[PDB]
Design an enzyme around this catalytic site. Structure first.
Site, PDB file in Angstrom:
ATOM      1  CB  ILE A   1      60.152  88.171  -8.943  1.00 41.06           C
ATOM      2  CG1 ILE A   1      61.133  88.906  -9.903  1.00 41.06           C
ATOM      3  CG2 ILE A   1      59.547  89.177  -7.936  1.00 41.06           C
ATOM      4  CD1 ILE A   1      60.426  90.012 -10.698  1.00 41.06           C
TER       5      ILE A   1
ATOM      6  CD  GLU B   1      60.253  84.582 -18.339  1.00 47.10           C
ATOM      7  OE1 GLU B   1      61.192  83.900 -18.740  1.00 47.10           O
ATOM      8  OE2 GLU B   1      59.205  84.032 -17.848  1.00 47.10           O
TER       9      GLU B   1
ATOM     10  NE  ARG C   1      63.898  82.348 -15.934  1.00 46.37           N
ATOM     11  CZ  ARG C   1      62.815  82.771 -15.294  1.00 46.37           C
ATOM     12  NH1 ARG C   1      61.935  83.548 -15.926  1.00 46.37           N
ATOM     13  NH2 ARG C   1      62.576  82.405 -14.031  1.00 46.37           N
TER      14      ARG C   1
END
Ligand SMILES: *[C@@H]1O[C@H](CO)[C@@H](O[C@@H]2O[C@H](CO)[C@@H](O)[C@H](O)[C@H]2NC(C)=O)[C@H](O)[C@H]1NC(C)=O
Length: 246
Positions: A71, A160, A163
């Site tokens: 970000i 996250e 991911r």
């Protein structure tokens, strides 16, 4: 762009958002069936905009670098905010240029600096969908110390989870009750670059990592990951940081 509304949110709608977020990131290739993010993207196309709405319907727009899922900054009403780092300053040349004012946060976006600014490690900050609602709310009005913790919540609940399927599931478990991340969550976050690199070096090494990666498992036990047959590679990781960026 991709969007997520906290009003009426549940595990299913959060999972649709994480889906949208993964599918917004461009790739030309998969490595061991996992999308390989691009080495670089030129101009404005290097930033994805994520529109987030709190339970009251107030909104911020977050800029995310597609190559890495980092970000860079966010817009709240007529003010833009960017981390204090060269990559974020570059992003500010491309996104939210119509903000009436731009504030450079007093820290870079990395976990070490954010934790220092927030006053706590992220071991101690609860996360979940209520914490995300609070984080969106915090970021609507400038307060740099409050914002560092809001941004630790935001980065984990959106980048996250995109991911790692395990982190997405952790946040779904926390749809109506926050809880500090498991130590497995923290380990995966801290290992994403290392895992991304070893999965790509395995391509000419018969599936075997050049250097093993150490993770904490769901049981709070340290494990060595040494090849692509691990559940971490076959099931959990969803996006690879390109080794050109490592
Ligand atoms: C590839 O990774 C697997 C683990 O994912 C390795 O097999 C495991 O490791 C030892 C046995 O050698 C045990 O502790 C585990 O229970 C094994 N699990 C399974 C499912 O087999 C394997 O040894 C690795 N192969 C290479 C070539 O490094």
């Amino acid at each position: 762009d991709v969007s997520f509304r906290l009003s009426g949110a549940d595990p299913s709608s959060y999972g649709m958002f994480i889906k949208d977020l993964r599918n917004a990131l461009p790739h030309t290739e998969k490595v061991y069936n996992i999308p390989l993010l691009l080495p670089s993207v030129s101009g404005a196309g290097r930033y994805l905009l994520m529109h987030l709405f709190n339970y009251d319907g107030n909104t911020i727009t977050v800029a995310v670098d597609v190559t890495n899922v980092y970000i860079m900054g966010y817009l709240a009403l007529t003010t833009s905010y960017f981390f204090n780092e060269p990559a974020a300053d570059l992003a500010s040349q491309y996104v939210f240029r119509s903000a009436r004012r731009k504030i450079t946060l007093p820290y870079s976006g990395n976990y070490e600096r954010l934790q220092i600014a927030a006053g706590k490690p992220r071991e101690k900050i609860p996360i979940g969908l209520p914490a995300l609602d609070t984080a969106i709310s915090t970021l609507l009005h400038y307060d740099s110390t409050a914002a560092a913790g809001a941004l630790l919540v935001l980065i984990q609940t959106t980048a996250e989870a995109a991911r790692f399927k395990y982190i997405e599931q952790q946040i779904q478990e926390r749809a109506y009750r926050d809880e500090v991340p498991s130590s497995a969550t923290i380990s995966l976050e801290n290992s994403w670059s290392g895992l991304s690199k070893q999965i790509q070096l395995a391509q000419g090494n018969n599936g075997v990592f050049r250097t093993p990666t150490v993770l904490v498992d769901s049981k709070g036990n340290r494990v060595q990951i040494t090849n692509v047959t691990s559940n971490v590679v076959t099931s959990n990781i969803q996006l690879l940081l390109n080794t050109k960026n490592i």
